[PDB]
Amino acid sequence: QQAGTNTAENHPQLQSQQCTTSGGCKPLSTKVVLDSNWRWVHSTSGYTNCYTGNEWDTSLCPDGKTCAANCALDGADYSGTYGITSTGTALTLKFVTGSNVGSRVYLMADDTHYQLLKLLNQEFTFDVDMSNLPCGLNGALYLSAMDADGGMSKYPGNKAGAKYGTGYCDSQCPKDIKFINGEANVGNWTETGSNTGTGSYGTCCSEMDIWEANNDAAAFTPHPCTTTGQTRCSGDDCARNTGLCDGDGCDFNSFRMGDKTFLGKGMTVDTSKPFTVVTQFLTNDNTSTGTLSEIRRIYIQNGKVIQNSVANIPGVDPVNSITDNFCAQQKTAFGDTNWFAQKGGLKQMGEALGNGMVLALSIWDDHAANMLWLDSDYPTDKDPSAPGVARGTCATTSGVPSDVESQVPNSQVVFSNIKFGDIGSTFSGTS
Numbered sequence: 001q002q003a004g005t006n007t008a009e010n011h012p013q014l015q016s017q018q019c020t021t022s023g024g025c026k027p028l029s030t031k032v033v034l035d036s037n038w039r040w041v042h043s044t045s046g047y048t049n050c051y052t053g054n055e056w057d058t059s060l061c062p063d064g065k066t067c068a069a070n071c072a073l074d075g076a077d078y079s080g081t082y083g084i085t086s087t088g089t090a091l092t093l094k095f096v097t098g099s100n101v102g103s104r105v106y107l108m109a110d111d112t113h114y115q116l117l118k119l120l121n122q123e124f125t126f127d128v129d130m131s132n133l134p135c136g137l138n139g140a141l142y143l144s145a146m147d148a149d150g151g152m153s154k155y156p157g158n159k160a161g162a163k164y165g166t167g168y169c170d171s172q173c174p175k176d177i178k179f180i181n182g183e184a185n186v187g188n189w190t191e192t193g194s195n196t197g198t199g200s201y202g203t204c205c206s207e208m209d210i211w212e213a214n215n216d217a218a219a220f221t222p223h224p225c226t227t228t229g230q231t232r233c234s235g236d237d238c239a240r241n242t243g244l245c246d247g248d249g250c251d252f253n254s255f256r257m258g259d260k261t262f263l264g265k266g267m268t269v270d271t272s273k274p275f276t277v278v279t280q281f282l283t284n285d286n287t288s289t290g291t292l293s294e295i296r297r298i299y300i301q302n303g304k305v306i307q308n309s310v311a312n313i314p315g316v317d318p319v320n321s322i323t324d325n326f327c328a329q330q331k332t333a334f335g336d337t338n339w340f341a342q343k344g345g346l347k348q349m350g351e352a353l354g355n356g357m358v359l360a361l362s363i364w365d366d367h368a369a370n371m372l373w374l375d376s377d378y379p380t381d382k383d384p385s386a387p388g389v390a391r392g393t394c395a396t397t398s399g400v401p402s403d404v405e406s407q408v409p410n411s412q413v414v415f416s417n418i419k420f421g422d423i424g425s426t427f428s429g430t431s
């Protein structure tokens with residue numbers, strides 16, 4: 001895609017902190033950028049749309065390469081069009097804004113590069129307020145193995161880059177992304193909703209879901225893929241799980257893992273109020289060159305340090321962190337194939353963390369599965385009493401996009417106090 005000039009692109013500021021054991025925490029003047037799929041796409045020479053509603057203009061876009069040459073991504077009115085605001089340290093993502101639904105933004109080091117986070121033997125911490133983020137919605141904060149320049153160096157057809165939020169990939173190998181590898185994804189374009197569609201290509205990479213949650217349920221989940229870095233896929237390679245990527249991931253959802261009273265409204269982690277989420281990425285030898293061996297989670301709320309809940313499932317050791325053994329046990333216990341291990345498990349996840357990943361923040365609803373995999377019974381055809389089927393208490397009828405978009409359009413999530421750095425350094429304790 002080309003870089004449009006009709007609307008200035010001004011990235012909201014969202015400061016973060018980098019932390020070391022000896023030096024403490026220091027601010028970084030980071031910013032956020034709207035993902036390219038949400039932007040206006042129009043002829044490079046004027047104002048005519050290349051994409052309107054859920055279809056491309058086949059005059060401007062008869063093929064992927066021609067489209068990318070003819071068409072430009074443009075600047076965004078963050079608040080007015082997309083419901084995205086920042087105080088400078090706290091990011092608010094509103095659910096519906098006019099006909100716009102959801103958003104995803106990435107953390108930038110500066111105006112043309114994503115912040116590249118290298119979290120092996122490090123920790124990531126943030127605060128979240130989900131008080132207004134109900135059943136069926138997901139406020140997600142996650143890492144993807146995107147390129148810092150959004151693909152510009154690799155793909156001559158992409159002249160827009162990180163400044164316009166290009167180069168997305170994730171473990172689901174999504175085919176709804178409009179620009180991949182510097183080409184419009186117009187092949188066999190298929191409408192999937194009023195403003196969305198899919199093309200013949202998907203875009204795949206390893207993904208670490210630090211936080212997928214609403215006020216009913218939360219999960220953290222590594223998803224390794226066999227490839228390294230953002231990869232365009234077609235055919236069977238795009239297929240979730242059996243293709244390049246572990247689409248299911250090895251998830252830790254406290255409720256799915258058998259503690260139904262740990263996290264939710266008025267629970268131990270009280271989702272009716274803001275709280276802090278710490279995630280630590282430990283290696284076997286406590287070095288940044290070691291193999292990722294454990295992902296730990298600590299919460300802080302009202303100054304109380306809250307350890308993660310323990311798993312309580314027959315055949316699963318009662319642990320409270322993600323390890324390769326936990327993954328094998330829960331997969332067997334839940335009847336799920338260990339695609340996670342098939343793609344190389346935590347070691348493979350760690351190599352992606354080691355090479356650096358980009359931080360995404362998003363609010364969304366789910367047209368495929370109504371978010372039931374997060375907060376209800378999934379699959380919808382299994383007995384909810386079987387180990388693993390039940391992930392939350394939301395009704396099995398909840399989360400249909402047409403419903404939540406009309407019923408709770410002013411839902412929002414607030415992500416703040418973003419910090420990363422040495423293990424144990426982004427937060428402190430005292431007696």
Ligand SMILES: CC(C)/N=C\[C@@H](O)COc1cccc2ccccc12
Pocket residue numbers: 140142170171172207209212247248366368369373
């Ligand atoms: C934040 C996103 C990109 N991370 C991963 C999510 O897409 C996981 O989604 C999912 C995970 C597992 C099963 C599913 C079934 C239907 C729809 C989505 C599913």
Ligand SMILES: *[C@@H]1O[C@H](CO)[C@@H](O)[C@H](O)[C@H]1NC(C)=O
Pocket residue numbers: 282284285286
């Ligand atoms: C790594 O650190 C952990 C604490 O999380 C500690 O228990 C362990 O002894 C350390 N291992 C080595 C090799 O120093």
